[PDB]
Ligand binder design. Structure first.
Ligand SMILES: N=C(N)NCCCC(=O)O
Ligand SMILES: [Ca+2]
Length: 223
């Protein structure tokens, strides 16, 4: 997260870190045994780390649970990043509490102008490189589909939206991949792609989660 702020320990209780020896992606806890992330975060040997603030220090609220299975969206295209969404099932149910909690799926899509909370452990620099240990947060509005399409000609599908600031300075970044965009208590987005971070006229692009709720629910019901 570039140009954001320190969230505060466990203030984003649905935020997960996906770990394969090291943090490599974010994710969102959606019930006691399932996490939503980006398909571009797919790999084998994932351990889901819940209740994290400082990802390099055991602080006392963590739950580490290995993934039993991952399900990349059936129509995920890694070249275009269309349908950039994946479900991860935990080997055991997380113990839900005030600091480890699921985030509600939307029943309605969000409109341009609505304010959202974007979070992660990604790069905090737009030019250089610095990775934070504690969770970073950014409040950002959803941008109009027309401004999103104008920013990235030929690249924005109906399964994507832009959020952030066309003036630059404030954005998600490398390592925030797969993490949440939460608006009015609903998971509306997944950190998907961009062109660098926090650059003028190049806001972050996010998977449009409301398009996938039916798939998420039916997948959970049979797995
Ligand atoms: N680039 C932005 N704005 N956000 C992060 C997307 C994932 C990435 O670039 O590695
Ligand atoms: Ca920790």
């Amino acid at each position: 997260i570039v140009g954001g702020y320190t969230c505060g320990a466990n203030t984003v209780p649905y935020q997960v870190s996906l770990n394969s020896g090291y943090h490599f992606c974010g994710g969102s806890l959606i019930n006691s045994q399932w996490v939503v992330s980006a398909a571009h975060c797919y790999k084998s040997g994932i351990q889901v780390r819940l209740g994290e603030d400082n990802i390099n220090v055991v602080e006392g609220n963590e739950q580490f649970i290995s993934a039993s299975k991952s399900i990349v969206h059936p129509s995920y295209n890694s070249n275009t990043l269309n349908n950039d969404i994946m479900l991860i099932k935990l080997k055991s149910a997380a113990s839900l509490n005030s600091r480890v909690a699921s985030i509600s799926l939307p029943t309605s899509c969000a409109s341009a102008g609505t304010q959202c909370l974007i979070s992660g452990w990604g790069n905090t620099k737009s030019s250089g490189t610095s990775y934070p240990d504690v969770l970073k947060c950014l409040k950002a509005p959803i941008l109009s589909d027309s401004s999103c399409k104008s920013a990235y000609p030929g690249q924005i599908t109906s399964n994507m939206f832009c959020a952030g600031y066309l003036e630059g300075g404030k954005d998600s970044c490398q390592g925030d991949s797969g993490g949440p965009v939460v608006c009015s208590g609903k998971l509306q987005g997944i950190v998907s792609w961009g062109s660098g971070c926090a650059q003028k006229n190049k806001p972050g692009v996010y998977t449009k989660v409301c398009n996938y709720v039916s798939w998420i629910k039916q997948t959970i019901a049979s797995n």
